[PDB]
Amino acid sequence: VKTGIYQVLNGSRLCIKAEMGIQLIVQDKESVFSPRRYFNIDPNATQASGNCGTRKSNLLLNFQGGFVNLTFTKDEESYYISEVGAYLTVSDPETVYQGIKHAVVMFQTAVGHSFKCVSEQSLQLSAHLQVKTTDVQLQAFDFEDDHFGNVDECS
Ligand SMILES: *[C@@H]1O[C@H](CO)[C@@H](O)[C@H](O)[C@H]1NC(C)=O
Ligand SMILES: [Ir+3]
Ligand SMILES: [Ir+3]
């Protein structure tokens, strides 16, 4: 689970800066104790793009098989991840799994600061699809000379 360094821009100004490792867990079997399919987002094989905004942004990460979409909202003061979507193709059998969590308050951080959380974070997107983050340090909206803000933590 290698940590990727991602970035979203408004022409030249920094809109979103995100470092993290991301894993997708799909539950093949109806039995909750049965093994699951793991998929590591490989950062050297993943395209970051996304859309900046005064009150709402998104970091989208695309890879062969699908994507992970992190949507940010700033309430002011403070910003947070307000939505998470994912899409993942498995070759055999031949399934696309996907899911979106719509109304969440996640990694909420005082505006102008950065969020850090090296500890594994987790979110059920659908009933079978789960996303896990690790080694997270990110920041959105307010920036100062392309550096991480006054920092914060989770647990
Ligand atoms: C990513 O999120 C934005 C809203 O923040 C949305 O417009 C876009 O459709 C999403 N992308 C995907 C592929 O889910
Ligand atoms: Ir599903
Ligand atoms: Ir939190």
Residue numbers in the entry: 223 to 377
Which sentences from the paper describe this structure?
The family of lysosome-associated membrane proteins (LAMP) comprises the multifunctional, ubiquitous LAMP-1 and LAMP-2, and the cell type-specific proteins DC-LAMP (LAMP-3), BAD-LAMP (UNC-46, C20orf103) and macrosialin (CD68). LAMPs have been implicated in a multitude of cellular processes, including phagocytosis, autophagy, lipid transport and aging. The five human members of the LAMP protein family are characterized by a conserved 'LAMP domain' directly adjacent to the single transmembrane helix. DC-LAMP is a highly specific marker for mature DCs in humans and other mammals including cattle and pigs, but it is not expressed in DCs of mice.
